[PDB]
Structures are given as C-alpha cells and as structure tokens.
C-alpha cells in the first residue's frame, strides 16, 4: 500500500532541498528519522515534518504497523517564483527571484 | 492610433535597436500596415449579357 504526504509552496530552493532528499531514499523510516535528526541543515526540518505526516497518514487512514515501512519514493519539484527589485550603483536596478518548491514523500510497508 | 509621436530613446548610445515611434506597425499595440477602408464591390454587366 502507498501513502503520500506533500508540502506545497515550501520556502526554499529546490536545489538546496535535493541535497537532503537523497540521504534517505530507500531506507527504513526508523533510521531515516534519526538520520534527519542529526544533520545541520534548514531543509532537514521540512523533510522530517513531511515524513512524520506521511507515517501518521499511513497509520490512521489505512492499516497500522509502522515497524516495516520504507521510503519508496521521494522527489522535489519547482514552485512559482516571486519577483522583487534590488537597487544597484549608478542608478541601475536588478531583478531578484525567490524560488519555492514542492516536496513529496511516499511510504510503503511492502 | 492614439498616442504621441515622441522618439522612445535616442538614436545612438543605447545597445538597443533603433526606434522612432511607439505606433510602428511591428510593435505590440501598433497600427496596421495596410489598414482597410469602407469599400464598394458592385460590378457592371451589359444589358445584352443579362
């Protein structure tokens, strides 16, 4: 059985979040949690919250027994960007992008 | 086309293509190159042919 949890419009660039996603691709949830607990990165908190939400969904809605779950799939997409202005020298102006991302996690007992 | 006939920017110095009007027919919201007018389409036939 597949259970999915998502976090859309997360305030972070996709490239920075992708460094943490591959740390746990294919592991068991029990070791994925404490792997995520001891990395000093901002995106680790977001990915950990998504993973815990997925585990709770997989426990409540469908069957129980989270002792044999695995991270079957995980990937990060790109959300819409917000555009701003930053002044520069001699009267010029520059465009700033604030990128977002979508985070998806799939777990399965099988 | 509604608008003013002022040159958008100077001829030389800026790294942009030369422009001379905002109503040019190749700008967005510009005019039509060969715009149409109300027209008459009737032809002539001889009486004997009719």
């Amino acid at each position: 059985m597949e259970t999915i949890a998502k976090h859309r419009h997360a305030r972070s660039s996709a490239q920075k979040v992708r460094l943490v996603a591959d740390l746990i691709r294919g592991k068991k949830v029990s070791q994925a949690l404490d792997i995520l607990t001891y990395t000093n990165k901002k995106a680790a908190v977001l990915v950990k919250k998504v993973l815990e939400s997925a585990i709770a969904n997989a426990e409540h809605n469908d069957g129980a027994d989270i002792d044999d779950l695995k991270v079957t799939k995980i990937f990060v997409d790109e959300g819409p960007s917000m555009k701003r202005i930053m002044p520069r020298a001699k009267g010029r102006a520059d465009r700033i992008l604030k990128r977002t991302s979508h985070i998806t996690v799939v777990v399965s007992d099988r | 086309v509604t608008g003013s006939g002022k040159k958008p920017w100077r001829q030389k110095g800026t790294g942009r293509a030369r422009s001379g009007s905002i109503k040019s027919p190749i700008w967005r919201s510009g005019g039509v190159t060969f715009a149409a007018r109300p027209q008459d389409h009737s032809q002539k036939v001889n009486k004997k042919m009719y």
Partner: peptide
Amino acid sequence: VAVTVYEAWRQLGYKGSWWWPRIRGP
C-alpha cells in the same frame, strides 16, 4: 490576508562616456 504584487522601473539611459584615450586616435 493580502495578495502579492510586483512593480518595475527603467533607467533614463545615462550617457556614459569612454574616459580613457581613443583606441586608434589621430
């Protein structure tokens, strides 16, 4: 809650000059 809005501005195209000597002057 409020929705996000964008704005923009263009420069006057200041007439900069090449203050060093000419490339192949007289």
